[PDB]
Every structure is written in C-alpha cells, then in structure tokens.
Write an enzyme that holds these catalytic residues in place. Structure first.
Site, PDB file in Angstrom:
ATOM      1  CD  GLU A  35     -20.611 -16.695  18.747  1.00 10.65           C
ATOM      2  OE1 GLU A  35     -21.574 -16.240  18.065  1.00 10.65           O
ATOM      3  OE2 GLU A  35     -19.429 -16.271  18.627  1.00 10.65           O
ATOM      4  CG  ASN A  46     -23.059 -13.870   9.392  1.00 11.25           C
ATOM      5  OD1 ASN A  46     -23.172 -13.538  10.584  1.00 11.25           O
ATOM      6  ND2 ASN A  46     -22.664 -15.087   9.023  1.00 11.25           N
ATOM      7  CG  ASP A  48     -20.941 -12.381   4.838  1.00 14.76           C
ATOM      8  OD1 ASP A  48     -21.927 -13.019   5.141  1.00 14.76           O
ATOM      9  OD2 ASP A  48     -19.792 -12.753   5.132  1.00 14.76           O
ATOM     10  CB  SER A  50     -22.335 -16.309   5.277  1.00 14.42           C
ATOM     11  OG  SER A  50     -21.916 -15.408   6.281  1.00 14.42           O
ATOM     12  CG  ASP A  52     -22.685 -16.978  12.056  1.00 19.82           C
ATOM     13  OD1 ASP A  52     -22.035 -17.212  11.033  1.00 19.82           O
ATOM     14  OD2 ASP A  52     -22.412 -16.017  12.868  1.00 19.82           O
ATOM     15  CG  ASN A  59     -18.772 -18.835   8.407  1.00 19.88           C
ATOM     16  OD1 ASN A  59     -18.590 -19.288   7.268  1.00 19.88           O
ATOM     17  ND2 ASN A  59     -17.757 -18.447   9.214  1.00 19.88           N
TER      18      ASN A  59
HETATM   19 CS   LIG Z   1     -24.515 -13.266  12.874  1.00 17.02          CS
HETATM   20 CS   LIG Z   2     -23.714 -14.921  15.576  1.00 16.96          CS
END
Ligand SMILES: [Cs+]
Ligand SMILES: [Cs+]
Ligand SMILES: [Cl-]
Ligand SMILES: [Cl-]
Ligand SMILES: [Cs+]
Ligand SMILES: [Cs+]
Ligand SMILES: [Cs+]
Ligand SMILES: [Cs+]
Ligand SMILES: [Cs+]
Length: 129
Positions: A35, A46, A48, A50, A52, A59
């Site tokens: 990650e 992201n 969309d 959002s 992370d 998120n």
């Molecule tokens: Cs991401």
């Molecule tokens: Cs990620």
C-alpha cells in the site's frame, strides 16, 4: 516516517494488530509494504475523487474526513491527516474497523492481489518481536 520492515512489525504488534481478526502480523506488514512502501506520509488520489492516506492507504469516502470527498461518512471519526502521522495508532485503530467490515483484509485490494495466500511469514522473518 518510512519504517523498516521489522520496525513496523514491532509497532503493529505494539498496537494489537498481530492476529487481529485472525490475520497474522505478516499479513499486515505485507499489506503496508504494497500500500505505502512503509511510508506513513503516502497519499494517492482514486479515480472517484476520494484519496487514500497513510501506511494502509485508508480512504476518505468511507473512513476519514479530508473535506473534499463528497459523501464522506468518516466512519473512523478522524481527519485523514491523522493517518499520516509517525505514530501509527490512528491508522491501526481505523484498520481494525475496516477489517471488521465484513470482507476481512480483502478491503485492501493490494492485499488480495499481492499478499493473500502467499508466504506472509517471510515479512516478519528475522525480526526480534
Ligand atoms: Cs489509490
Ligand atoms: Cs492505494
Ligand atoms: Cl505472519
Ligand atoms: Cl476474515
Ligand atoms: Cs485473535
Ligand atoms: Cs466500504
Ligand atoms: Cs461519522
Ligand atoms: Cs458492513
Ligand atoms: Cs463490507
């Protein structure tokens, strides 16, 4: 902060993640590797809208508030910035909620695609824990 592997394993264990919801320490270390590369300050947008945040790339639609994610529920009741701290407590507390949401560690797609089923014990091998 960029953790070393064993350093992060120890910190995660210090915060009760080893075998939390049945997921061994190596699963958590593996997830953090893929990650964030063990970097608490990691952020990634992201598709969309959002974002992370942190070691476990939590998120902002469901879990933390960043003020720019329409429909934000903030189920961890924290600012997303708190997930970027050297102290992993906030990220751990929120991850505990996430992994309890129904699908276990599949909540982290990278865990499913890169850790699940693998020799995750290798991530803690040699560590003084
Ligand atoms: Cs991401
Ligand atoms: Cs990620
Ligand atoms: Cl393990
Ligand atoms: Cl599970
Ligand atoms: Cs347990
Ligand atoms: Cs969700
Ligand atoms: Cs909330
Ligand atoms: Cs749920
Ligand atoms: Cs769920």
């Amino acid at each position: 902060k960029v953790f070393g592997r064993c350093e992060l394993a120890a910190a995660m264990k210090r915060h009760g993640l080893d075998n939390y919801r049945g997921y061994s320490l190596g699963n958590w270390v593996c997830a953090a590797k893929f990650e964030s590369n063990f970097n608490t300050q990691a952020t990634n947008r992201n598709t969309d809208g959002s974002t992370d945040y942190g070691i476990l790339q939590i998120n902002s639609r469901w879990w933390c508030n960043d003020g720019r994610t329409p429909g934000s529920r903030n189920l961890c009741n924290i600012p997303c910035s708190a997930l970027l701290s050297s102290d992993i407590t906030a990220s751990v507390n929120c991850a505990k909620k996430i992994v309890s949401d129904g699908n276990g560690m599949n909540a982290w797609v990278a865990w499913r695609n890169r850790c699940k089923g693998t020799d995750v014990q290798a991530w803690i091998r040699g560590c003084r824990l």
